[PDB]
């Protein structure tokens, strides 16, 4: 049964062609998010261990589920005639990073460093599990306002991580790298690092740097807010036009701008309470 194991509440999110409901699990009052996905609207399909053909999103969410809280946890899923239903563990109270930056403006570097660091660990976790998210952006990041813990959500554009070239893409265009714009190909890690550069500019300047293809491929980053030299260098490094010139995750986390990160609880105490 399905409508019997979850108390179902109101729609969640900003308002788009997607369907994610707030819910509570009757078994233990666990907050859940109940995501519906129409079969006719699914890009890539995968096969589970039982050979059961499921949306790739389900495959990817299973590979990253764990006690590491940087990534949304899939707790169960159900198939229905025209759709799949995903039961996700829902933190609360939460606000997504997009609304957070809109309400607060450009973030202090201390806060952006804690947030960026936690995103880095979450993406490293995905990659260690064989999963490429492909839609890293503030809209796909939830802030647990009480614990100060960030959460990567919506794996609906992801793929299995691989070392060869990708020629397809269904993520957010303004976060996609210039090699995707110019040649419709990319490699997964360096494209992720590019989106992390867009994300970090977003955090310290209050909005993304590029809106148009010409800016994305232009190789110029104007800073619209006061930003430290160290942070500017890291951002420009992540947004190197040539993929092989971008830093690895290790190089990002060893960057001098990234030292002395706050802990989640400290982050909540100093910046979210």
């Amino acid at each position: 049964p399905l409508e019997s194991q979850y108390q179902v509440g109101p729609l969640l999110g900003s308002g788009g062609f997607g369907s994610v409901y707030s819910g509570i699990r009757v078994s233990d009052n666990l907050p859940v998010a109940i995501k519906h996905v129409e079969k006719d609207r699914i890009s890539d399909w995968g096969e589970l261990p039982n050979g059961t053909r499921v949306p790739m999103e389900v495959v990817l969410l299973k590979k990253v589920s764990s006690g590491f809280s940087g990534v949304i946890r899939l707790l169960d899923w159900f198939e229905r005639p025209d759709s799949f239903v995903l039961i996700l563990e829902r933190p609360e109270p939460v606000q997504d990073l997009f609304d957070f930056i809109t309400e607060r403006g450009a973030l202090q570097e201390e806060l952006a460093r804690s947030f960026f660091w936690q995103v880095l660990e979450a993406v490293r976790h995905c990659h260690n599990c064989g999963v490429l998210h492909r839609d890293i952006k503030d809209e796909n990041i939830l802030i647990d306002l009480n614990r100060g813990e960030l959460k990567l959500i919506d794996f609906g554009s992801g793929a299995l991580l691989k070392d060869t070239v990708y020629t397809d893409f269904d993520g957010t265009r303004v976060y996609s790298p210039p090699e995707w714009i110019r040649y419709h190909r990319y490699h997964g890690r360096s494209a992720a690092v590019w989106s992390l550069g867009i994300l970090l500019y977003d955090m310290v300047c209050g909005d993304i740097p590029f809106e148009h293809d010409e800016e994305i491929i232009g190789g110029q980053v104007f800073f619209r807010q006061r930003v430290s030299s160290e942070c500017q260098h890291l951002i420009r490094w992540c947004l190197a036009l040539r993929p092989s010139d971008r830093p690895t995750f290790e190089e990002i986390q060893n960057h001098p701008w990234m030292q002395d990160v706050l802990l989640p609880q400290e982050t909540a105490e100093i910046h979210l309470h």
């Binding site: 997009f98 957010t172 209050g206 909005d207």
Partner: peptide, 8 residues
């Protein structure tokens, strides 16, 4: 300046 979401 106009800040906006960007669908996938």
């Amino acid at each position: 300046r106009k800040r906006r979401r960007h669908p996938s």
